[PDB]
Amino acid sequence: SGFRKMAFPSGKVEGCMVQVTCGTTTLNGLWLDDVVYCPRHVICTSEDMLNPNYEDLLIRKSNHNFLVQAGNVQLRVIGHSMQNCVLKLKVDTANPKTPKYKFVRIQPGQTFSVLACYNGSPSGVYQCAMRPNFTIKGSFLNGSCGSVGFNIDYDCVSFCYMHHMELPTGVHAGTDLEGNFYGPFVDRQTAQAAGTDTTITVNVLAWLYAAVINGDRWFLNRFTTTLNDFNLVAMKYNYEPLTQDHVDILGPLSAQTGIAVLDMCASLKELLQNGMNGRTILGSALLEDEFTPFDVVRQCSGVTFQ
Amino acid sequence: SGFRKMAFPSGKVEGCMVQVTCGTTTLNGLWLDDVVYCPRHVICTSEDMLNPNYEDLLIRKSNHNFLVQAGNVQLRVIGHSMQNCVLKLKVDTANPKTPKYKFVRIQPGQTFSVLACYNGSPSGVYQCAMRPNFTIKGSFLNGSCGSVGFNIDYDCVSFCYMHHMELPTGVHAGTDLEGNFYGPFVDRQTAQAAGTDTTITVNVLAWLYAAVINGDRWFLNRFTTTLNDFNLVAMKYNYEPLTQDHVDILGPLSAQTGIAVLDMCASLKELLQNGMNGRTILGSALLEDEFTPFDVVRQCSGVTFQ
Numbered sequence: 186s187g188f189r190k191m192a193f194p195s196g197k198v199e200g201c202m203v204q205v206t207c208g209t210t211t212l213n214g215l216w217l218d219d220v221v222y223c224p225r226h227v228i229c230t231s232e233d234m235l236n237p238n239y240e241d242l243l244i245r246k247s248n249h250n251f252l253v254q255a256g257n258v259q260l261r262v263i264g265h266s267m268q269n270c271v272l273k274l275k276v277d278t279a280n281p282k283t284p285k286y287k288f289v290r291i292q293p294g295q296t297f298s299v300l301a302c303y304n305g306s307p308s309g310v311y312q313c314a315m316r317p318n319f320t321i322k323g324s325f326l327n328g329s330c331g332s333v334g335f336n337i338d339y340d341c342v343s344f345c346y347m348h349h350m351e352l353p354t355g356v357h358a359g360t361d362l363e364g365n366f367y368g369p370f371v372d373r374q375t376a377q378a379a380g381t382d383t384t385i386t387v388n389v390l391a392w393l394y395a396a397v398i399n400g401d402r403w404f405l406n407r408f409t410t411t412l413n414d415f416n417l418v419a420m421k422y423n424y425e426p427l428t429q430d431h432v433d434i435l436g437p438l439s440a441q442t443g444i445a446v447l448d449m450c451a452s453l454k455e456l457l458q459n460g461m462n463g464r465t466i467l468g469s470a471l472l473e474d475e476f477t478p479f480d481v482v483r484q485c486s487g488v489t490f491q
Numbered sequence: 492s493g494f495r496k497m498a499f500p501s502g503k504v505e506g507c508m509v510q511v512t513c514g515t516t517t518l519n520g521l522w523l524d525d526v527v528y529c530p531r532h533v534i535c536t537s538e539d540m541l542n543p544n545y546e547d548l549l550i551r552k553s554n555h556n557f558l559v560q561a562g563n564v565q566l567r568v569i570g571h572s573m574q575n576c577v578l579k580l581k582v583d584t585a586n587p588k589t590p591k592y593k594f595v596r597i598q599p600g601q602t603f604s605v606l607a608c609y610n611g612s613p614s615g616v617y618q619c620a621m622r623p624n625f626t627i628k629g630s631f632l633n634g635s636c637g638s639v640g641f642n643i644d645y646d647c648v649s650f651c652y653m654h655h656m657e658l659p660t661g662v663h664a665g666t667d668l669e670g671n672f673y674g675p676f677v678d679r680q681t682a683q684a685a686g687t688d689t690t691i692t693v694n695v696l697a698w699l700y701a702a703v704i705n706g707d708r709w710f711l712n713r714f715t716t717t718l719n720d721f722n723l724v725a726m727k728y729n730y731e732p733l734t735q736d737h738v739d740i741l742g743p744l745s746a747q748t749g750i751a752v753l754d755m756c757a758s759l760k761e762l763l764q765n766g767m768n769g770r771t772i773l774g775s776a777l778l779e780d781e782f783t784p785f786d787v788v789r790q791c792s793g794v795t796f797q
């Protein structure tokens with residue numbers, strides 16, 4: 186019993202974190218096999234970041250300008266290239282701690298764990314979601330760039346996020362491990378604003394199922410609804426529209442609890458229209474949207490990794 | 492920017508987790524040097540747990556009855572003893588992944604990270620606090636016993652919690668690594684109820700400082716208070732009394748923000764008396780009490796480990 190915001194164990198990723206310094210800038214890199222991946226803005230001054238021409242800035246850099254350090258030991262850089270917004274630094278030694286891994290570009294609404302690092306050293310681990318506006322709500326200070334987000338399934342680490350930028354409003358933007366930004370964001374210090382922070386409806390429903398499983402059941406009611414009715418309410422409250430695909434994904438939680446998805450939708454509708462009247466659900470006074478259906482099943486079932 | 496419920500990186504602890512099976516019961520153990528620590532109730536049936544005589548049950552167990560497996564490899568048990576509510580299984584091989592470590596008995600109000608495990612395999616990591624009533628609000632299923640809680644400072648892992656029991660109300664009880672339960676709880680399946688879940692006042696104040704640092708400042712007001720005045724309010728709302736020791740511990744956050752501790756207390760007083768009027772602080776609609784002053788400084792400053 187109990188339901189917590191839970192991250193994946195981070196050891197497999199800790200063993201891949203290195204420090205990358207180019208001139209005056211230090212950030213973190215990800216060492217997998219004989220390649221270190223890091224944000225291309227390692228090559229910029231803070232002057233450069235207003236309007237950088239990365240191809241021109243890179244011309245002045247050679248292999249020996251990229252100082253890569255794994256713990257106390259220096260790595261020898263034997264090549265470098267730019268791929269979208271990341272650099273790939275080829276080193277002469279394969280990381281002996283390289284786990285089984287994949288690079289995945291996640292969809293908005295999916296969750297992942299972040300290992301926040303500074304100077305190639307781990308500071309902490311927490312759970313995030315790719316928001317519908319393609320930002321994440323992380324915890325990142327100067328020097329955290331190149332920290333990564335990931336999921337684990339049994340023994341395989343799927344890396345999905347590398348941290349690049351903080352917007353003036355305090356939320357975060359980054360790339361996949363191919364160096365393509367999520368959303369419209371760019372690696373320049375400019376006027377870029379986030380769009381509407383829409384709530385991830387299917388995740389809220391999953392968390393209501395988690396609540397029922399764990400004995401929080403005061404919000405269950407005598408009502409049902411339809412997809413189209415419920416979506417009229419979702420729209421008013423800036424929730425994502427619920428689709429039949431979402432209903433299908435909630436099938437397993439519906440079967441476990443015996444609560445039809447549309448009945449749970451009717452509970453959510455009343456919560457949106459009436460609020461929580463000073464009560465809590467799983468220790469929260471708001472409707473939580475950063476647990477996916479798979480996260481709920483996983484945590485409620487004890488799935489393990491390594 | 493950003494403030495998240497953040498756990499310590501878990502790799503140092505992942506490398507210590509093993510599976511322990513005694514007869515029909517499997518749970519997790521902690522392998523440090525040549526000793527495996529686990530809950531003594533590994534020796535019980537579910538029959539036995541209503542009224543177990545552990546000394547008598549242990550008489551029927553020999554070294555070869557404790558099956559200890561680290562990943563895919565079996566460990567040879569060369570001795571065993573009971574210390575309070577834990578067993579210490581001496582094995583013939585020191586754990587090559589043993590980190591620098593200490594055993595610490597934490598005080599109520601202090602926080603720690605939990606690595607939830609099943610069958611000796613890590614499932615996830617999350618952050619907890621020792622509540623004033625000596626329970627923790629974790630996420631633990633059958634098979635998670637022997638999972639541990641810990642803090643890290645640079646390279647040293649301070650283990651403070653081993654999981655033993657779930658109370659009928661869904662909260663959790665366990666021991667330190669010497670096998671002494673936190674609070675009055677016992678390792679029998681009996682009528683034991685938790686006392687009042689008091690809110691950790693100094694932690695709420697720390698989190699309000701974290702909020703100010705991160706730009707959430709709507710709750711600041713024109714008022715101040717005194718320790719004795721504020722505590723009249725703390726008492727009504729089942730908050731721990733604030734002491735001068737707590738004020739002193741908040742000194743560094745007071746200095747960073749320029750907000751006197753007692754002025755912040757006056758903000759908290761208004762929040763307790765008026766509620767949050769539908770607003771949020773650091774993404775929460777309630778007053779968060781599981782960040783310590785040290786947690787706030789650490790997360791806001793980027794401290795690292797390994």
Ligand SMILES: CCOc1cc2ncc(C#N)c(Nc3ccc(F)c(Cl)c3)c2cc1NC(=O)/C=C/CN(C)C
Pocket residue numbers: 398437438441481482483485486487609632633634
């Ligand atoms: C930790 C001990 O093992 C389990 C404990 C559980 N405790 C509670 C609930 C609940 N409720 C579980 N299952 C569950 C079901 C369906 C749901 F939708 C939800 Cl949320 C939860 C549990 C599942 C566990 N383990 C498995 O399911 C293992 C299966 C593996 N096979 C493919 C071979």
Ligand SMILES: CCOc1cc2ncc(C#N)c(Nc3ccc(F)c(Cl)c3)c2cc1NC(=O)/C=C/CN(C)C
Pocket residue numbers: 303326327328704743744747787788789791792793
């Ligand atoms: C990640 C890059 O490094 C830092 C970034 C910071 N960003 C914001 C704030 C803020 N605000 C910080 N400090 C801080 C101060 C006092 C407070 F009370 C709070 Cl909460 C936060 C920061 C501290 C950092 N690093 C250090 O403090 C290192 C010192 C080590 N020496 C002993 C040698």
